[PDB]
Amino acid sequence: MRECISIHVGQAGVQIGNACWELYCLEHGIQPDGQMPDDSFNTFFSETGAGKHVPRAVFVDLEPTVIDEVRTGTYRQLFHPEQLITGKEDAANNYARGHYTIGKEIIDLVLDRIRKLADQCTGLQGFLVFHSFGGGTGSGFTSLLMERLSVDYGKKSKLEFSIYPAPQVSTAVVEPYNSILTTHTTLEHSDCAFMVDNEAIYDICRRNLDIERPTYTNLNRLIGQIVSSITASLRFDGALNVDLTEFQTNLVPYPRIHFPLATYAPVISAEKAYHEQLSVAEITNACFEPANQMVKCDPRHGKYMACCLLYRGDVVPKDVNAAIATIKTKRTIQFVDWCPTGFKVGINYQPPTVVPGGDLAKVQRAVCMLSNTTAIAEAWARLDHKFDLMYAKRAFVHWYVGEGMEEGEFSEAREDMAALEKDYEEVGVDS
Amino acid sequence: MREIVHLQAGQCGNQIGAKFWEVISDEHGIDPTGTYHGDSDLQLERINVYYNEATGGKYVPRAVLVDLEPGTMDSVRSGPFGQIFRPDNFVFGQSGAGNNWAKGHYTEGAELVDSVLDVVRKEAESCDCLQGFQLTHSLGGGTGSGMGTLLISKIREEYPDRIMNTFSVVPSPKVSDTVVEPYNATLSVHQLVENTDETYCIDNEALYDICFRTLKLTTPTYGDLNHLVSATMSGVTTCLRFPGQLNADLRKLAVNMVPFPRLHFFMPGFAPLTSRGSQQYRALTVPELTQQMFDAKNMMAACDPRHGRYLTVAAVFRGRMSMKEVDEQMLNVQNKNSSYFVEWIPNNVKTAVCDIPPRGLKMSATFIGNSTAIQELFKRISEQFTAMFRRKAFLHWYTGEGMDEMEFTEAESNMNDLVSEYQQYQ
């Protein structure tokens, strides 16, 4: 009666969806063959008369090298042969190449299967989008997918999970260009958008999980752990359930303010887990701590706007009550004056699961935090500073203007981000 | 309810607390794994004093382990009970002090201490009503005496209205294993007296004589010595963990044993120890425990009570007894040894009786005595200090790291008027 559709775009999308769908299979007991060895799988796994459960997602990327590993690997028989679309040439770190020239050729192939999967489900809440800002495919192709899904389906919700470019390190050179030119599209054709930062997960893995040298394979397990904790209200029973509509109305006050931040706690290894008690006050204090936050911004510098708490496991509502009541006493955490009640909670009975060969410990209770705050504009300002000194010498412009767009798109995208920053600080000013 | 935070610093402190938690675990019935294995139900009542319970029914100790070299925590973790300590209580650096008080206090121990206070604050706040602290260290060098006293000097302003135990290892005339031992001990006891509550002196010379004569052993290794003093270490907090008739905690002791704020040095003792060759010969009865506990050869310090007078004494008894045998016997020994007790205070004895005996014995007694004879250690180390300081020896290793010449004179001056205050009661 309820369903969700996931769209994974780019190399980041297809690689963080592999660990995410791996955890979905283990949570419902789905072996990689595609069958069984409760009707909670119907939101994610369809049905067949032979007993086979197939997923309800699409995998879009212009690089066939990373899509073909799903064909070669263990989950070949489980994933649908046509749900995973293959390109021919990559966008090559270019917004112009992925949007105007190549992206128009494969949009009709993707949208045909989006319509087919949407007609499979009787009741659909919305779409979850996993992509990356700095990729050519994750920015160029997504910028037309969202603007075409918005007119194909009017009031369907659009949740986003974006791999945010990092303040210090990155794997690209023109990432400030690809990040700026996609925020014009995502500001108007999206409902809510969470941000994750790669090197922030690096330091969390180093100083909490005690693993010295992490790899993308365990970063995608942490990101896939967050998405499972978000949607676990839909899948499993609880004391009170929270919908995808519920927190998307509790976290945005304005159409221009739709950028919250994600936080997961506790994050600890198997050896360290059994020595200290993990009470509810233990795990809700780490989410409020700026050290455990996985986006490189300090809420101490910023101001809180709204918060959402997602509890899983052996949790009692009374000790939750004492947790927020203790938090509201602290003056280290600062709230805006126009939102005195900025807390929405959610309770789930099922404790989180663990994967074989994983890094996380078997934990009885966990909490996921989705906090909207003003401190993201600190990260916005340090990115457009890098954009402006790059653009002053007209670097890399001929890669974009020779593929089909004009040069005025750079000016209006910077003008929107200047006005967006003006809107963030005006909201932040109290009366 | 009532909680005791244990601090453990130094090489000798790390070796003395490993056997300390071995004795408690056997007393409370805890396996090396960390699960409760006890025949009775009385051992699980007061377990919150030493243990912090974690999920799965596992009890971990609330003790912190700090040192500058990583060579001793490897031995502790490889020990028989090394797996029960939590791995994040292991706080250590990469460079040792190397037998230098100024290294562990001013240039190297001043960096690690910012993390040590953070760890002990994590456990001092998690309890309900903290009773006090308990530190085990030695004065043999600046690794555990340079920073063990500094930890005392940092916690005192953080928690002023508490009680601090310190089971310090004092130097001895013949087991002097450090040429700069008078330097590192005098500089520590200068900073230790004014900001502590109870201090116990445990030197190796008395433990060697007890193992060779009273216990009749041929090989008194360090495992044997640590078990002797850990019996008294666990024997001082029996009333906190087990029910009895005269319940007396560390503070009810400290009011009686400390008449003046600068008189808080005690003489440890253990009564019922006996060699195997006379175990069947000796009648285990409370006149024999009382007659044995007052002998000078049973004392845990190299001081003779025959050269001093007794200020205040306490005895804590373990096991099902009647109490008037000892009440008659400590009245008896007060009358016959009248010349050895000070006459300006009457009733110098303190009685504590607990209903739970130690493991393997019907009874026990633990002797804690504040006596005037302890100045002989202070006179002996002050004379060694003057000889080494009059020729200005070994001063470049201390003055080269931010220590001035006049700080040693203040250390000597506070030592001399401590024993000048101490002398007037003879």
């Binding site: 100083r207 360290k272 | 009542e45």
Partner: peptide, 29 residues
């Protein structure tokens, strides 16, 4: 490090170990 971030106050213990308000907690049974 990792574990030092999780401070909190109070702790559960178990039913045979008596703590403060162990009387009030046994009484509801």
């Amino acid at each position: 490090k990792g574990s030092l971030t999780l401070r909190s106050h109070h702790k559960k213990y178990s039913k045979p170990v008596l703590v403060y308000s162990w009387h009030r907690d046994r009484e509801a049974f």
